[PDB]
Design a protein around this nucleic acid. Structure first.
Length: 206
DNA sequence: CTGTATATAGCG
DNA sequence: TCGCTATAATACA
């Protein structure tokens, strides 16, 4: 150590995976997250894609420093003030990695039928070259990376997909230039009966 | 022969 | 039960 990483690498891809918490501690944090996080509803839970509007197949929330905003798929989200459980996770991640963050996005999947579609994390408000930290609690779910040049009907090349399960209590670091080159998603898994909560920490420009 | 870009439907 | 397809109504450069 101080930590033990599994490195995930391939053309233009640079990420790393590790387990931060044991089962007892991870169960405590999950219960506190279910008690305290406030999720967006109604008009703040609909997006526009290919000209049509949809309610998102999951629940979402945003927290962070004053003044920042976060915009994607026709939806603009404003961040709530930091709370203790979220400050504790942020500080632990900063200590382990040496990086700093001023914003967090939270996604909750109620069972295996809740999911999220393919995309890159590259909006203008992200500081150039900064990393993104992904922390998970609850049921294990499969996570998938796909190369931009390999997408669609007859693509330019065919780079193999990269798949890994994200377990209860784990951290995935996504480093530059991962998000200029690769899309990611969380597909439907019908045999999964229990809920999962995911947190992604970021550096946002004012 | 030729602009690039983005949640569910309807298959197999 | 899992995964590829074809959007669709614009907004750019």
């Amino acid at each position: 150590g101080s930590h033990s990483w599994r490195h995930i690498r391939a053309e233009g891809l640079d990420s790393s995976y590790t387990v931060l918490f044991g089962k007892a501690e991870a169960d405590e944090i999950f219960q506190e997250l279910e008690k305290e996080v406030e999720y967006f509803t109604g008009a703040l839970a609909r997006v526009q894609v290919f000209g049509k509007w949809h309610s998102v197949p999951r629940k979402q929330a945003t927290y962070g420093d004053a003044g920042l905003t976060y915009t994607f798929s026709g939806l603009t989200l404003s961040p709530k003030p930091w709370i203790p459980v979220l400050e504790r996770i942020r500080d632990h991640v900063s200590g382990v990695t040496g990086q700093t963050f001023n914003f967090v996005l939270i996604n909750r999947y109620k069972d295996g039928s809740d999911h999220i579609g393919e995309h890159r994390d590259d909006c203008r408000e992200l500081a150039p070259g900064s990393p993104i930290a992904s922390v998970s609690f609850g049921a294990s779910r499969d996570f998938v990376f796909r190369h931009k040049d390999s997408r669609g009907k007859s693509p330019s090349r065919r780079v193999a997909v990269v798949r890994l399960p994200l377990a209860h209590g784990s951290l995935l670091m996504m480093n530059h230039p991962t998000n200029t080159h690769w899309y990611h998603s969380l597909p439907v898994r019908k045999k999964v009966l229990a809920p999962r909560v995911n947190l992604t920490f970021r550096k946002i420009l004012l």
